[PDB]
Design a protein around this ligand. Sequence first.
Ligand code: ALF
Ligand SMILES: [Ca+2]
Ligand SMILES: [Mg+2]
Length: 1155
Amino acid sequence: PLVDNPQIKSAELLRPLPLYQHAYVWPYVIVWPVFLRVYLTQELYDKYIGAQEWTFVWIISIVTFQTLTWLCTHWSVNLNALFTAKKASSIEDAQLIKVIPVANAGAADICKLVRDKVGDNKTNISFLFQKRRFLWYPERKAFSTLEFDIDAEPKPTLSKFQLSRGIESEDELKRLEQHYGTNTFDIPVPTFTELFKEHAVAPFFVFQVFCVGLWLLDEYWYYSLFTLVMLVVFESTVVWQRQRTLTEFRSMSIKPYPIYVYRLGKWTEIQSDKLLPGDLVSVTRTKEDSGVACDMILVEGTAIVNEAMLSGESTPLLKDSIQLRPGDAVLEVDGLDKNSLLWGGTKVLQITHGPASGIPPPPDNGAMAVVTKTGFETSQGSLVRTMIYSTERVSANNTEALLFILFLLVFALAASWYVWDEGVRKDRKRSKLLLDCILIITSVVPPELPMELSLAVNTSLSALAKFAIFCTEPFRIPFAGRIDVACFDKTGTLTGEDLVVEGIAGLGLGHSGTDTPKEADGAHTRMVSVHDAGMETTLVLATAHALVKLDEGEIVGDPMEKATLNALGWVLGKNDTLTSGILGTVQIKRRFQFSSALKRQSSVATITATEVKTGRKLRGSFVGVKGAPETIMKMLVTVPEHYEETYKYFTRRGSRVLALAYKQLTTEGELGANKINDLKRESVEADLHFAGFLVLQCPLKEDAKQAVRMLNESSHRVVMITGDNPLTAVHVAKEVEIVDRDVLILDAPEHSVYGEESLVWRSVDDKIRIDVDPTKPIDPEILKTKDLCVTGYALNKFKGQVGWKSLLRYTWVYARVSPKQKEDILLGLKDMGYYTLMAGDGTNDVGALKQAHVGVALLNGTQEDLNRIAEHTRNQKMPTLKLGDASVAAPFTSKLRNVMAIPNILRQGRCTLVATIQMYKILALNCLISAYSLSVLYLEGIKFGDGQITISGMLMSVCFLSISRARSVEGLSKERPQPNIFNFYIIGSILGQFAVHVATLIYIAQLCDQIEPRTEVIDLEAEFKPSLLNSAVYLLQLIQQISTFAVNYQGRPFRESLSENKGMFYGIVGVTAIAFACSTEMLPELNEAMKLVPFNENFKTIMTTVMIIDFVACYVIEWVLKKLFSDLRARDIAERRPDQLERERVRKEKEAREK
Ligand code: ALF
Ligand SMILES: [Ca+2]
Ligand SMILES: [Mg+2]
């Protein structure tokens, strides 16, 4: 293979051809002078030198052939490589290379090779594909990505980075600059011309232009020019709207910032753009709206960072140096060196200083680090590349449309063959025969299909703006009608980012006055605010934290600690001080931390509390601990009588409860220096007391439960993908009723041996623990009894084995997944056969948002902020929202924080999915009657009047415009709409209705010929004359055109009813009433109004009978074929157990009885 990248499937070297050797110029140069000579001076009519119709046919044919030969190089890259290039012999003369990627990872392309000359008189051959560099390696004679110092076949020794210095000499700097490039992101941001060029090449636009050009034979310039002008205006405004919304939602701007680099033995100030792998950079605090420029490894110093891009959370992480490690291989994947790597894109919250290479300290007093990657090869470079180079634009050009056009073209060719044969048997003029064949060919295949689908989509696009839900690709709305799996994020989508504190309860335990309210089992539900709390609870809350105050006054730490400190009201100060209703001073000396084992935070301090209520004074040493109720129960010496039951009620009703405890070490005096250091964790937990139960409200949006419940019972499956801990993910997923059963977490053992690999089925309570290996099937029983929660660490161990497909069907919760793993799940679900939706807000789910069929990016705005922005803009004509990165990669964008915008889009999908489907069916019917009205009826003497066709045309236009516009129904239904158009039901219904219409027309024509015989000749140029046959055929055609609209219209569970459609119902009623009144002949003036012949008494009953028979037969055929072959059932992954259905029915009945 040429390219050694799994992204690239195949490659081929090419060499360009000159302009005169192309495949669409040279045959034209051969052909054109021959025809010119024949038409000009041959004087022999081999190609009809004098006939105007034949010469025009030749000119149009040759021009169309040349235009198609030119356009075929734009719709494919194989034809581009076969028409405008030749296969090169080797790399010596090759200049262009054609690259094709994996079918689900981009688009094919043909790139240009570039050769650069290094100072050592050598040649470097490279090419750029999807803004990614590829180099030609002659040692293995292939193409590779690049070779960095961090990644190599032998793992580098730590002495390479510990003793590293800056890049010396100008030659090395120039070589690195010309070999690795600059550290920047080059977004092309195309202009209007490129967008219009891309839009005007699409096959539907070419088809419409060709049809309109064919309408220039004898229809005169009136109809063709107006249609062409409106088409050009519509395409121009579509392109302008697309470019405007692309510029509004997609910016992708990164501003460089100055940094200090140790180059040539001195510290200089360099912009962040000019950085090369091997520099010695000094990192400091990262300001607002900025991040780390390049991927680097820390050498000296400690950094507190905020990795909000990879994990998705906001908990600060601690990264240590590498100075305390000997010469060893870099274990950067999972070893001790993973905590030393500093990724590019995160923010450095704090820098702590505390060298082997003898380097002077930087002037800005930062931390030394060595760059390892730069440019588009960093961690966020892959996300930026997948933002814009992952999927193709979705438009009206589908395979279903092509098959539909081919079907109608087959019928058109049959009709044209019949017309041409009957016209050549009678030896008529070839001009009128050819014009009629062209007319029926253009009439059968509808040129109005794309401009009707576009209107049906733009109506939904305009209707979606009321919920502040903007869209970028409008043709993805029908995909929302067949959604089978709907994933969800956790930290930004369902759970609210902010946190509130309800208060502290359980302080009435121990001695009770029988006055506080109690539950049925005796649980104390007394709620006391923190401002009215006791002295002991405040003292414990003022020391059991882990927050640290920066030099500029900012504070960092856990969100719950910040929330409880804000609720406390005390103020943190330097040297670990807590100052001021207690109005005391707390000085914390020693602190203890937890790492998910023995979950409790302990601290010691010196306290001076001057109570204002009781007027007492407290001073001296103090010990405060905060943790789980079970651990405090284990370490308690005087357990209250209702301690066990008073927290179960709180933790059951969606809340987080934490127990607090205190210990008075020395009442008088302080412990002093060199005394707390020798104390261990077990020593301070000898005796404990009880202070209270801090209760925190469950972080969840008020619309989360309602939206998930609406999605669950509407034949959709809701899964959840998050990068948080499995415990919190399982708790949140159980609260919103995503999973309601026993939950098993497949993950590494909690012992964390870190040396051997193992997979176990843990539980929420450590009572079930079995061993599973990734090379065997999962279980025949686990997938049936208990639900699953597969973590992201063990997802890679199951990649490629036989258990991968079993773990993509019976799992609903994924926890701790990398940004790359968030799209593997969606790709697997898409390849399995399901449609997927995903809603998220962060930067880690960019690839998942791109690879899903429809993606929503929920922002953090509110209605009041939107109103303020609108009124500020209005005042400018006479606050802001953070766009982020998720809105760039998501086709949809909801500007409101409500998660109810996720079901609403679905409510606006089905109405677009149903209507479009109906359109297809109805169009097919009108593309089959007309083919019968121009091939068999045209050859007879049946010709309608000039005034009668206007009514039919107006009725058809009104009905089509009313069908294209649609409105949404109130609530989601259990039955799904028809997915595609090429199943047995649609084709069977179309063919049955066409057969009924043909049989009725044949019977009416036969009986009308029997009643009134014809003895004259059939004239194809005679004008309109009133007769029985013309009136009968006109009435039957009007009734059939009414029946094609009043039978194939379904709107009961997915749209508005036919009675509420004012545009269509009134027209249908009026036309049907007029036709039936003229058939039954109750108004003699009406028949004379539009040139009708008086009817016999016996013919009237036959006419009414056949009209009613036609209507009833069409309705019965449609109903039977809908009842027999409807694909209205739910998918296999969305099946609901009887228990869930029974619970839903019980809840619905209770709500109905309540109201
Ligand atoms: F809320 Al996440 F990855 F868990 F964006
Ligand atoms: Ca038509
Ligand atoms: Mg998030």
